[PDB]
């Protein structure tokens, strides 16, 4: 179901959580310009509704770590998250590793690139989870790879999902149980994979969708992001993807594409 | 092979044509603003290199027909092209019907929306056909659904084709033999279908690619165009496409998608 209008209060939400804990992950790669306002918008909730918040630094070479530390956030490196396993590039890798660095019964994911996030994003996302039943994933929407790639593709291969307005949204929450059960697609495939894998396994009903209000990058990427979105999506649907990277044109350049998911994190914690 | 630099002259090209005729099709739906300059850029060639040029009017309700008639072009309606078969919406329908209205051994397709086309487009497209051998299709490139949908998708499902810079280009030429052999995908699928169907059947070598120099619409469409591009492409690759139209969001709207190709025009002319 879909909440076009969120309206729980931090106090009632905190109430309804009934012993379950809530972690918050901000994945960040070189986001020094926005990282502070993102953290700051959520800071106050910590020790109340939110029990834990960390920044997953995916190898920033700018001032992201220091700015975030200055805003009172725990910063975890991909290496710190899971020391025993060498590190892979891409967003999916970081979201995956973040599971090992957190312990909330509920994990909320919020991108670090957001321009002045609303302080009610977390409580709005965590809404259906705390007050509903059998909701395990809640995606957000607001206001493109999403409108030209992901959404047409779902109409074609998983139309039951063509009602998701933002399949690729970086802002969503889920139970720890579901996320540890699932593989994690590499790079920019992670979001579309979790959507399909959750649907395929729990049905359209474990999935909520909430309005977050209102809302970038070069066509150089995007092409690349689109490619991986296609590979993850094709794979979840039983279509063999070639493995070949998108080539951009003179002169030539081939962006990397990965057909390798991470296993469910359950596996790694025996 | 790829001509990064075209350099035949109307006189030598005309020479090399050795009895083969050349038709030119401008499909047009409501293009009153550009139709004249497109025709005008090609007019002079008629009775020389080009033997026949027509405008395929796909039901314009503006002044396209009259402007084009005023520029000395034959205008054919979809109905006139093939009276005996009721008319379907979409670009593919019009390109298909145009085969019945022409008789050149070589058909050249040029979009009617082009801003001040170069007068050497036709001769550059028809180049490899007239002076090469075993080239049956030549696509153009210059300077997106193309960069986010069509091109990533070909990397994934027909990577041998990921070297085409403009899979979706509206400017291309082909032998009458090849085009009558092929089915024609509906609407905005027509281009991607002909590319795949030609490759699958004649190999990467019957296909040329020429530089045409240098170079629009709302994300409302595009979404829709992307969808049909996905359905035609999925179908050529043996993937069952759901048949479900892309739904846009409040409030709702579902754009049409077609899984129905036209049969090879050979069939219709017994
Ligand atoms: O290797 C990584 C690790 C993390 N992130 C982070 O994950 C989020 C999504 O990145 P992006 O904004 O580029 O995705 P988009 O919204 O552009 O599709 C951001 O907060 C990133 O810094 C990333 O893009 N790549
Ligand atoms: O039902 C039809 C019949 C013809 N055309 C024509 O075919 C070409 C391609 O249309 P468009 O420029 O919209 O394609 P785009 O380059 O935007 O992907 C144009 O000259 C159109 O007027 C069309 O789009 N739809
Ligand atoms: Mg982002
Ligand atoms: Mg056009």
Q: Among all chains, which residue has been given the structure tokens 């051994």?
A: B105
Residue among B104, B18, B96 at smallest CA distance from B58: B96
Two tokens, residue B222? 């595009």
Beta bridge partners, A113, equal none
B145 is in an annotated binding site: yes
Please compute Rg for chain B using Cα positions: 18
Of all atoms in ligand 1, which is nearest to the CA of residue A111?
20
**Rounded to the nearest whole angstrom, what is the distance from the C-alpha of residue A109 to the centroid of ligand 1?**
12
DSSP conformation letters of B149-169: IIHHHHHHH-GGGTT-S-TT-
CB-based contact, B234 to chain A, within 8 Å:
yes
- Find how far residue A97's CA is from the centre of its chain: 12
H/E element holding B184? none
Two tokens, residue A230? 């296609």
Beta bridge partners, A109, equal A25, A172
CA distance B100 to B89: 17
Q: Among all chains, which residue has been given the structure tokens 């396994």?
A: A201
Distances (CA, A) of B247 to A156, A162, A165: 11, 7, 9
- Strand arrangement of the beta sheet that strand A106-109 belongs to: A2-3, A207-211, A137-141, A172-175, A106-109, A22-28, A52-57, A74-77
CA distance B18 to A63: 69
Cis peptide before A172 (omega within 30 of 0): no
DSSP, res B269: -
Residue nearest to atom 5 of ligand 2 (CA): B91
B143 is in an annotated binding site: no
Residue among A40, A51, A55, A54 at smallest CA distance from A13: A51
Question: What was the structure determination method?
Answer: X-ray
Count CA within 13 A, CB hemisphere, residue A149.
Answer: 30
Of all atoms in ligand 1, which is nearest to the CA of residue A90?
1
A116 is in an annotated binding site: no
Ligand 1 pocket mutation, candidates A42, A170, A226, criterion most atoms within 8 A of CB: A170
- For residue A158, the chain B residues in CB contact (below 8 A) are 242
- Alpha-carbon torsion, ordered A29, A32, A34, A37, to 10 deg: 120
State phi, psi for B175 to the nearest 5 degrees. Answer: -70, 150
Cβ atoms of A239 and B239 closer than 8 Å: yes
Residue of A145, A157, A242 with shortest CB distance to B156? A242
CA distance B105 to B135: 13
Residue of A219, A230, A250 with shortest CB distance to B147? A219
Q: Taking CB atoms and an 8 Å limit, are A222 and B147 in contact across chains?
A: yes
**Rounded to the nearest whole angstrom, what is the distance from the C-alpha of residue A48 to the centroid of ligand 3?**
27
Q: Taking CB atoms and an 8 Å limit, are B148 and A234 in contact across chains?
A: no
Residue among A61, A62, A85, A105 at smallest CA distance from A184: A85
CA distance B33 to B41: 14
Closest CA–CA distance from residue B219 to any residue of chain A (Å):
8
DSSP, res B50: B
Surface-to-core class of residue B240, CB atoms within 10 Å of its CB (0-12 exposed, 13-18 middle, 19+ buried): exposed
Q: Among all chains, which residue has been given the structure tokens 């290496």?
A: A79
- Alpha-carbon torsion, ordered B189, B191, B197, B203, to 10 deg: -150
Residue of B147, B165, B219 with shortest CB distance to A144? B219
Residue nearest to atom 12 of ligand 1 (CA): A113
DSSP, res B89: -
What SS3 state is found at B241?
A: coil
B197 is in an annotated binding site: no
The sign one gets for the Cα dihedral B31, B245, A191, B155 is: negative
CB-based contact, B254 to chain A, within 8 Å:
no
Two tokens, residue B221? 């469409």
Residue of B159, B223, B257 with shortest CB distance to A244? B159
Cβ atoms of B135 and B106 closer than 8 Å: no
H/E element holding B20? none
Distances (CA, A) of B186 to A108, B120, B236: 43, 29, 13
Q: Taking CB atoms and an 8 Å limit, are A148 and B257 in contact across chains?
A: no
Strands A74-77, A52-57: pairing is: parallel
Two tokens, residue A6? 């969120």
Domains in chain B: boundaries: 1-270
B172: left (phi over 0), alpha (psi -120 to 50) or beta: beta
Cβ atoms of A55 and A48 closer than 8 Å: no
Please compute Rg for chain A using Cα positions: 18
CB-based contact, A239 to chain B, within 8 Å:
yes
Q: Which residue of A has its CA nearest to B148?
A: A223
Cβ atoms of A139 and A164 closer than 8 Å: yes
DSSP conformation letters of chain A: -EESS----HHHHHHHTTT--EEEEEEESS-TTTHHHHHHTTGGGBTTTB-EEEEEESS--SSHHHHHHHTT-EEEEHHHHSTTS----SHHHHHHHHHHH---SEEEE--S--SS--TTHHHHHSHHHHHSSS--EEEEE---HIIIIIHHHHHHH-GGGTT-S-TT-S-EEEEHHHHHHS-B-SGGGHHHHHHHHHHHHH-TTSEEEEE-------SHHHHHHHHHHHHHHHHHTTPPP--PPPEE----EE------PBPPHHHH--
Cβ atoms of A51 and A22 closer than 8 Å: yes
Beta bridge partners, A211, equal A141
Architecture in CATH for domain B1-270: Alpha-Beta Complex (3.90)
- For residue A155, the chain B residues in CB contact (below 8 A) are 227, 230, 242, 244-247, 257
Cis peptide before A251 (omega within 30 of 0): yes
- For residue A163, the chain B residues in CB contact (below 8 A) are 247
Residue nearest to atom 23 of ligand 1 (CA): A91
Two tokens, residue B260? 């129905």
Residue among B51, B52, B208 at smallest CA distance from B127: B208
- For residue B249, the chain A residues in CB contact (below 8 A) are 165
Surface-to-core class of residue B64, CB atoms within 10 Å of its CB (0-12 exposed, 13-18 middle, 19+ buried): buried
Cβ atoms of B24 and B52 closer than 8 Å: yes
Task: Choose, out of B189, B245, B246, the residue to mutate when testing the contact with A (most A CBs < 10 Å).
Answer: B246
C-alpha distance across the termini of chain B, in Å: 35
CB contact set of A4 (below 8 Å; sequence gap of 6+): A211, B250
State phi, psi for A209 to the nearest 5 degrees. Answer: -145, 120
């Amino acid at each position: 179901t879909t909440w076009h209008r969120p309206g729980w209060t931090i106090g009632e939400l905190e109430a309804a959580k009934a012993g379950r804990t809530i972690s918050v992950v901000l994945p960040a790669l070189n986001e020094e310009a926005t990282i502070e306002s993102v953290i700051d918008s959520i800071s106050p909730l910590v020790d109340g509704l939110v029990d834990e918040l960390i920044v997953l630094d995916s190898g920033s070479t700018d001032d992201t770590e220091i700015r975030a530390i200055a805003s009172g956030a725990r910063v975890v490196s991909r290496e710190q998250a899971l020391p025993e396993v060498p590190v892979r590039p891409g967003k999916g890798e970081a979201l995956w590793r973040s599971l090992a660095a957190t312990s909330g019964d509920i994990v909320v994911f919020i991108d670090s690139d957001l321009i002045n996030p609303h302080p009610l994003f977390v409580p709005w996302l965590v809404g259906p989870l705390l007050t509903g039943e059998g909701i395990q994933l809640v995606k957000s929407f607001y206001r493109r790879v999403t409108e030209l790639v992901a959404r047409p593709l779902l109409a074609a291969l998983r139309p039951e999902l063509g009602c998701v307005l933002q399949p690729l949204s970086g802002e969503y929450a889920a139970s720890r149980e579901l996320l540890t059960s699932l593989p994690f697609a590499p790079g920019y495939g992670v979001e579309i994979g979790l959507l399909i894998d959750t649907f395929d396994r729990l049905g359209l009903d474990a999935i909520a969708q909430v309005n977050l209000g209102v809302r970038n990058r070069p066509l150089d990427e995007l092409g690349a992001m689109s490619r991986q979105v296609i590979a993850t999506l094709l794979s979840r649907c039983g279509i063999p993807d070639s493995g070949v990277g998108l080539t951009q044109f003179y002169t030539r350049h081939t962006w990397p594409v990965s057909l390798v998911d991470r296993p469910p994190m359950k596996v790694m914690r025996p």
